Amino acid sequence: LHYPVTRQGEQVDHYFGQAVADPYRWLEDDRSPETEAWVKAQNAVTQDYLAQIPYRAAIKEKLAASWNYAKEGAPFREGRYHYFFKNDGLQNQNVLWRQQEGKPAEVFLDPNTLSPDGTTALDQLSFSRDGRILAYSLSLAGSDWREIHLMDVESKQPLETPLKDVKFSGISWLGNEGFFYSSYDKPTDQHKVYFHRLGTAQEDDRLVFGAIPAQHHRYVGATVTEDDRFLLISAANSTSGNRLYVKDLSQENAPLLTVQGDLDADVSLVDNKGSTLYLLTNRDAPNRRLVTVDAANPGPAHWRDLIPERQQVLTVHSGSGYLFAEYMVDATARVEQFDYEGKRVREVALPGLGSVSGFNGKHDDPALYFGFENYAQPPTLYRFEPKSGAISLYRASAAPFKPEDYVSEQRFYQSKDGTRVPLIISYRKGLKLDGSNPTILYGYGGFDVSLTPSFSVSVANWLDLGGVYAVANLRGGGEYGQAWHLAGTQQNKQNVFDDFIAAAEYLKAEGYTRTDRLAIRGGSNGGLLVGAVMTQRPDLMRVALPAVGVLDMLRYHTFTAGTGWAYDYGTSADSEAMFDYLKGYSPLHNVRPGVSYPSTMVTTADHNDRVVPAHSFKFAATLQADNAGPHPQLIRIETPVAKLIEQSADIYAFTLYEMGYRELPRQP
């Protein structure tokens, strides 16, 4: 294996009187002739190395064959039909089907064919209270503009001419009379709420909110409660904070009452019961709380906590006369069922530890549906009986992976300083803890980002090859509260790396794998994680896979988009202490001559605004110049799902090959 020559320049930088050489400074220009030629030469060496891997084509074949599969959503009743979305696996847009009990299912609305070349997309969908009329918004191209169409659902023909010039709008019906929507014009950065009455022309739509000076806002929204009693109007100027107003529709010409008159917090309607409003908000509660207040005097001073804020971020769903609080605890789903009076009915017995969605329904739905998935289980739909709490399988995934063939377990290990850290491990059933299993340990560790379980075909293929997939919930993440995040920032960043090293040691100590059967992986802040751990403990793993990483911690902030990461990392310009700390772990600056590094495959696109290739380019150049051991230090520069399949195949093939496998660990 002969690496392309990478010339070293003479650039030398200085920080607080300290000199730091940057011989690959020229690689920071990803569009210069010399860099683009380097990229081409590196890719040639990498492709040549990968070409010798015997089973690379077989891995790619299985990935491609299992990548696409049919999907179906939960059914919902509107009028005399149950509607549900489906996707055959290749369709660009989901297709809406419907079925009347006692009859066969039929296609109801196929967005793909709304325009030859399928450039017309289905956005909002909203049926009248009786389900006889459907109002839905469509978008053309990558346009923010919308048209609201009105269809008679039985004949499937247009009821009226579509509403035009709609933008950033919801569609909320008031019974079967008409619906509220938002628009900037009549019917200029002044968003307004309008009411369209069925049987009338758009030009006659009543202006509801937003015209007088005190109501001028860039974004407004309107929602009518399911019982048609209240109109809630939200108004905002940006993504942070919104005012909220309520109007009692059961009263003749009721004025708007102020639920929240400032933009200091987010607050939104969950539902009402009688004159009681149920609101989800982050006002004085960053993790959110569910509150109630009487609609006749709805100001924040009167809000009463129904579900007080907790350490975990709250998501609320309502259905069948119950409220459901969803949280991710130790990074996995927990759902609690409450009645509208605040009594906790039960903790819902979810199918296992994973991620969920759903529990959304109408007041009178006899059952609710929820989706569940994790590293070893494809998205599956379950039916939930609200009264009994009974759960049953509604639709198994069409993905070519049977959940019963896999195992997912959560363990907790201790980091160097005693901190207990969560670790989710997945594999094919029948695995033995004899320390021989090829394992990929994945982590991120930063920016309050939580690593929660999610199914991916690529990971599932790894498990079928006989691999173990482990994900550590390191400090710096969002799995707990602010202290957990902060414990992995600025001058505490080392904790993240120590947490990851401890996960690798735990996997070995527990018999899942061993040093020559272990690979570590991560992207972006996760790439930094890999770069840092492989430079501090190059002997801990056999393979290192840093993707799109931030690897030059001394100059990351001077690059495009780097300024936004300053809160988590700090910059070499902050102070001598911050500079010394950053230089202490910066991967680029900690690669050393004579050291034997693990087999490495650095990955990145040839051009990137978020995380510039410069990081990966300079890091790969330095590994190639400094590594003295037998392992290859390669870089794969990306120049559709086709590319994703090729990327995953190269990584798994490279990983197994570097571990010495002549054949797959297990025949999939």
Partner: peptide, 6 residues
């Protein structure tokens, strides 16, 4: 206020 606005 969001978690982000620490």
């Amino acid at each position: 206020m969001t978690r982000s606005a620490f």
